[PDB]
Amino acid sequence: MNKTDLINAVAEQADLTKKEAGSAVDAVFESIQNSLAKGEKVQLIGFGNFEVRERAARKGRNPQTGKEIDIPASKVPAFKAGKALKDAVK
Amino acid sequence: MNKTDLINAVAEQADLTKKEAGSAVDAVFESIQNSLAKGEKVQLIGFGNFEVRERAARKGRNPQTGKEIDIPASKVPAFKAGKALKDAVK
């Protein structure tokens, strides 16, 4: 499934023009983006959650090379699937 | 942001009724779930990807039997953020 397939499903199931469904779909991904960007967890009952994971600035060791490196702090997107989604896939 | 906040954000940005936005949001999440349930990867340009991740079947050991057991393969949902969503959180 790509973004166009997604837009099409939305057009039917919600009864919108492909133009409208496209905006809705743009809006969903945009809304979510803007929420993680401001650090807000997105909790979607039934589906799952999108969170921002904080990684602390620390001393590390470069994986399979082994030198002591300096690791800057970081913020990365992360998704926690809910029960309904886990079950669907098992 | 919860699902209700999401629907309202979508209503605003796509200029649609709460009914239209509610149906769209439901449509996006039922679509993504149905695709993973069929084992289909979901590829969303800009946003990210939802995949069915294979966890390999491997060997284990029963502490109270002492025999080598088979721990079966498993499948779990997963999200790979795209450049745009990753960039937003940094």
Which CATH number characterizes residue A2's domain? 4.10.520.10
* Contact (Cβ atoms closer than 8 angstroms) between residue B5 and residue A50: no
Containing A27, the helix (H) or strand (E) segment is helix A18-37
CB contact under 8 Å between A76 and B89, yes or no, is yes
Domain that holds residue B69: 1-90
The resolution, in Å, is 2.6
Interface test with B, best of A5, A19, A29 (most B CBs within 10 A): A29
* Contact (Cβ atoms closer than 8 angstroms) between residue A28 and residue A42: no
* Contact (Cβ atoms closer than 8 angstroms) between residue A51 and residue B85: no
Interface test with A, best of B8, B33, B44, B52 (most A CBs within 10 A): B33
**A84 vs B: CB within 8 A:** yes
* Contact (Cβ atoms closer than 8 angstroms) between residue A77 and residue A63: no
β-strand partners of A70: A59
* Contact (Cβ atoms closer than 8 angstroms) between residue B15 and residue B43: no
DSSP-derived secondary structure letter, A6: H
In A6-65, the residues whose Cβ lies within 8 Å of chain B are 6, 9-10, 12-16, 20-21, 23-37, 40-48, 50, 52
- Phi, psi (5° rounding) for residue A66? 95, 15
Give me the amino acid identity at B22. G
Q: Rounded distance, CA B74 to CA B14, Å? A: 39
Sign, CA torsion A83/B26/B46/A36:
negative
The residues, any chain, with a CB within 8 Å of residue B38's CB and separated by 6 or more, are none
Sole residue written with tokens 């999440």: B29
Q: Rounded distance, CA A80 to CA A35, Å? A: 16
The residues, any chain, with a CB within 8 Å of residue A33's CB and separated by 6 or more, are B47, B84, B85, B88
Containing A72, the helix (H) or strand (E) segment is none
Dihedral of CA atoms B2, B11, A53, B30 in degrees, nearest 10, equals: 70
Q: Report the relative pairing of strands B68-71 and B74-81 from DSSP bridges.
A: unpaired
CB contact under 8 Å between B27 and A9, yes or no, is yes
CB < 8 Å & 24+ apart, contacts of B18-25 = B20/A14, B20/A15, B20/A16, B20/A20, B20/A24, B21/A24, B21/A27, B23/A10, B23/A13, B23/A14, B23/A15, B24/A10, B24/A14, B24/A16, B24/A21, B24/A24, B24/A25, B24/A28, B25/A24, B25/A28
**Number of domains composing chain A:** 1
Structure-determination technique: X-ray
Q: Rounded distance, CA A57 to CA A62, Å? A: 14
The residues, any chain, with a CB within 8 Å of residue B26's CB and separated by 6 or more, are A13, A14
The residues, any chain, with a CB within 8 Å of residue A71's CB and separated by 6 or more, are A55, A57, A58, A59, A60
b/e A46-57 (16+ beta carbons within 10 angstroms → b): ebbebbbeeeee
Give me the amino acid identity at A34. N
Closest CA of chain A from B16, distance in Å: 8
